[PDB]
Write an enzyme that holds these catalytic residues in place. Structure first.
Site, PDB file in Angstrom:
ATOM      1  N   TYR A  38       0.831  -1.169   0.000  1.00  0.00           N
ATOM      2  CA  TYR A  38       0.000   0.000   0.000  1.00  0.00           C
ATOM      3  C   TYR A  38       0.884   1.242   0.000  1.00  0.00           C
ATOM      4  O   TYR A  38       1.960   1.202  -0.463  1.00  0.00           O
ATOM      5  CB  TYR A  38      -1.015   0.020   1.114  1.00  0.00           C
ATOM      6  N   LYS A  93     -17.441 -22.406 -11.563  1.00  0.00           N
ATOM      7  CA  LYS A  93     -16.729 -22.244 -12.837  1.00  0.00           C
ATOM      8  C   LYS A  93     -15.319 -21.683 -12.584  1.00  0.00           C
ATOM      9  O   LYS A  93     -14.331 -22.114 -13.191  1.00  0.00           O
ATOM     10  CB  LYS A  93     -17.511 -21.307 -13.779  1.00  0.00           C
TER      11      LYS A  93
HETATM   12 MG   LIG Z   1      -8.674   6.420  -0.937  1.00  0.00          MG
HETATM   13 MG   LIG Z   2     -22.283 -22.667 -18.943  1.00  0.00          MG
END
Ligand SMILES: [Mg+2]
Ligand SMILES: [Mg+2]
Ligand SMILES: NC(=O)c1ccc[n+]([C@@H]2O[C@H](COP(=O)([O-])OP(=O)(O)OC[C@H]3O[C@@H](n4cnc5c(N)ncnc54)[C@H](OP(=O)(O)O)[C@@H]3O)[C@@H](O)[C@H]2O)c1
Ligand SMILES: NC(=O)c1ccc[n+]([C@@H]2O[C@H](COP(=O)([O-])OP(=O)(O)OC[C@H]3O[C@@H](n4cnc5c(N)ncnc54)[C@H](OP(=O)(O)O)[C@@H]3O)[C@@H](O)[C@H]2O)c1
Lengths: 411, 405
Positions: A38, A93
């Site tokens: 960060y 999936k």
């Molecule tokens: Mg921000």
């Molecule tokens: Mg599908």
């Protein structure tokens, strides 16, 4: 089996709800770690990407990140159950992307049935993703949606229900034709069903060398014949056939191939008897096929049979396609998955099934023996060779066709 | 700098980027996958189709926040665009995970028009338990957050706006307490009128400050009623009856300075005429409107907080959003409302008065901490924060009726 259903419900709720977790791929425990992950450290890759946009692939997950995106209008065989209800399938999936190709997935369920709303929302997500796998969007909307997004977006867009199915079945068909000494140019094909998958399958058969005149398509109301108007549309019109047949039974007379992409039971033994010698039967209706290999072998001992089920030989399993297809496309940082890439995957799958099967694959399947022929003409889903064969061929097709933006020299 | 090079390698090395998506369940065998995907995955879908609320039982929705940006105000880098902001949104997601155990999809959106952006984001609702808007420039961010809150039935929260308001509000309550002040009579000067400044002023009023006791200044000085130069709908709300025209004049007899502008904006001469025990929030980054030493040099009775980790009383946003979303998600709330925001303020203020554990002392190199002028708010790496604040947010959501669980 409703107790099997209860096993699935427990699986989805046990421990933490759902099937996915997002974790850090880098050290993130210490203040030092977080000063890189960060602020202020994170400004460095941001500035680099601002100056050279391609570097988004170097400093973020984009190059391994696919969106599985659905509006839940055609979930499995459940129909239009809505995007929240479809979320477990999209998480699932994503798990297949990860387990079969190492691809990270954000599953994105979109509450939009309007084509323009849906396309407008998805198009602008491009900065996030390396590719888009559209999933479980009903026909005929899915045809317009895919084509529009393919045109508007500069990352691969691929609707697996359409083309994944066409790729694996095409591979199987090439091999079935080879086994029976057939040429694609002369094979007579009957497709039962005219939905999302039947459309793409018919188109790829033609692309692989079949003639339109040799293909008859049927739907819920029978043969799609030229001139017909009931239940017709722009897409069904394309495959309207000059045939005199009106019933599935009639269409199958002397036919070489049955491709079932409809509903359970749709094909009976009586229909089978008049098919050509060595009939090729793909009965892919889930969860129950148009027919069973046993009923088929009983009516026709010379039949070659594939289905959508893993408990029978020759499973036309879509997992053979999309994972490698996106692997190849991502690794070449391609802007599309084009027809060249789809065809490359067909031919790779087909060729792989023709090779000697390693002991490793037999041991994965309980010690079963596999050799190329009527009981084995498409690779097994848990064969680790599939990624190794298909992804590089897709990558080479992307480079050859000029949609790759990053060259891969070798594997 | 070596540090930039270190940062680049950190992002580029190993798996590119900072996030990976993994399965939380077994997914190695045919049997495993027969539950994770077809045919077994149909069961939870059918359950959810029949009872929509069950999406929270069978998917990651209840622990999943979208960090969404169009990259128009990334850090202090400004409008660099959505792709260039992606490292920051992945990193924000890391903070969500490390501080609150929340999963994040970072979503970078190529839309700067408020309408287009909103129409793209609101249809993502089924995917998520909550939306954290991030690094979207003002004033578009006001309109966007406002519109999404009206359209969506999950929490929508722009951290740049309300995160600083919440944490600085906790710090302010404690500062007033220490100096024997009442919020209803405190005179406040907010320097800056951007994304964060506006929310700060609104939180102060919610904490009991009177709108008439608040002067807001921007790049052109005091925002006074009648002024037209560089005005907008949002600045207008906080326009003051004051005859003061400059930051200097506004600060005469002022109790509090809230600095959400630029470095050096606050000099010692302005400090001179502030009231006794002036409370000074210099939160401009990377360099504060004035430094803590330069401030105490001018005013020894000054209480000072900044946005930096190298001085006491860091107003760090990581103290806010993790617990706010944790509480919201756990009650399956449809909103993060003002009640929840205020609950976070009071809880943060309260934790600061607690004895600081040795774990925390050790975390910061044996440095002891006791509630006072040099310790107004919890340290960012204090692990008690989530345990203190998130339950208070959840209680607030339930009491105010936005909870669904
Ligand atoms: Mg921000
Ligand atoms: Mg599908
Ligand atoms: N790898 C695989 O195993 C695989 C892959 C994809 C699909 N499938 C299966 O194929 C089936 C359809 O999938 P889809 O995505 O294409 O769905 P779809 O878009 O809904 O297509 C349904 C099609 O089937 C037609 N139909 C319905 N009843 C029929 C009947 N008695 N006889 C002939 N046609 C009939 C429908 O006709 P109308 O248009 O006239 O209504 C429609 O054209 C599903 O069972 C699916 O499980 C299997
Ligand atoms: N927790 C924290 O530490 C924290 C949190 C948030 C923000 N900040 C910092 O606060 C500052 C503002 O952030 P932001 O997101 O609110 O930015 P912003 O949206 O860009 O707002 C900028 C504001 O600063 C005003 N401004 C520019 N120069 C000024 C000057 N000499 N004197 C007074 N006002 C001036 C601008 O006035 P005009 O409207 O006239 O342009 C505008 O109102 C930044 O330095 C930011 O890093 C710190």
């Amino acid at each position: 089996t409703t107790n099997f259903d209860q096993e699935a419900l427990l699986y989805h709720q046990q421990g933490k709800p759902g099937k996915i977790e997002v974790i850090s791929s880098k050290p993130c425990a210490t203040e030092k770690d977080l000063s890189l992950a960060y602020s202020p450290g994170v400004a460095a890759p941001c500035k680099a990407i601002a100056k050279d946009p391609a570097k988004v692939y170097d400093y973020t997950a984009k190059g391994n990140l696919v969106a599985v995106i659905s509006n839940g209008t055609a979930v499995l065989g459940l129909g239009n159950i809505g995007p929240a209800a479809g979320k477990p399938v999209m998480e699932g999936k994503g798990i297949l992307f990860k387990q079969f190709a190492g691809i990270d997935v954000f599953d994105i369920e979109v509450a939009a049935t309007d084509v323009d709303v849906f396309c407008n929302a998805v198009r602008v997500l491009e900065p996030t993703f390396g590719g888009i796998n559209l999933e479980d969007i009903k026909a005929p909307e899915c045809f317009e949606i895919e084509e529009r997004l393919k045109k508007e977006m500069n990352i691969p867009v691929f609707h697996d229900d359409q083309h994944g199915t066409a790729i694996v079945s095409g591979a199987a068909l090439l091999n079935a034709c080879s086994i029976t000494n057939r040429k694609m140019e002369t094979v007579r094909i009957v497709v039962n069903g005219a939905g999302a998958s039947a459309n793409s399958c018919a188109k790829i058969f033609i692309a692989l060398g079949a003639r339109r005149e040799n293909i008859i398509m049927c739907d819920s109301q029978g043969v799609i014949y030229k001139g017909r108007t009931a239940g017709m549309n722009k897409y069904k019109e394309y495959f309207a056939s000059e045939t005199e047949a009106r019933t599935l039974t009639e269409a199958l007379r002397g036919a070489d191939v049955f491709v079932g992409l409809s509903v359970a039971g749709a094909l009976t033994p009586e229909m089978l008897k008049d098919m050509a010698k060595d009939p090729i039967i793909f009965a892919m209706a889930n969860p129950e096929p148009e027919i069973t290999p046993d009923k088929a072998r009983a009516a026709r001992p010379d039949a070659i049979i594939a289905t959508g089920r893993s408990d029978y030989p020759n499973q036309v399993n879509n997992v053979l396609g999309f994972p490698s297809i996106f692997r190849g496309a991502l690794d070449t940082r391609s802007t599309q998955i084009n027809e060249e890439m789809k065809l490359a995957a067909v031919h790779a799958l087909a060729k792989l099934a023709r090779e000697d099967v390693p002991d490793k694959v037999s041991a994965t399947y309980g010690g079963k023996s596999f050799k190329f022929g009527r009981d084995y003409l498409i690779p097994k889903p848990f064969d680790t060779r599939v990624l190794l064969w298909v992804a590089p061929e897709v990558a080479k097709a992307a480079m050859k066709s000029g949609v790759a933006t990053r060259a891969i020299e070798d594997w």
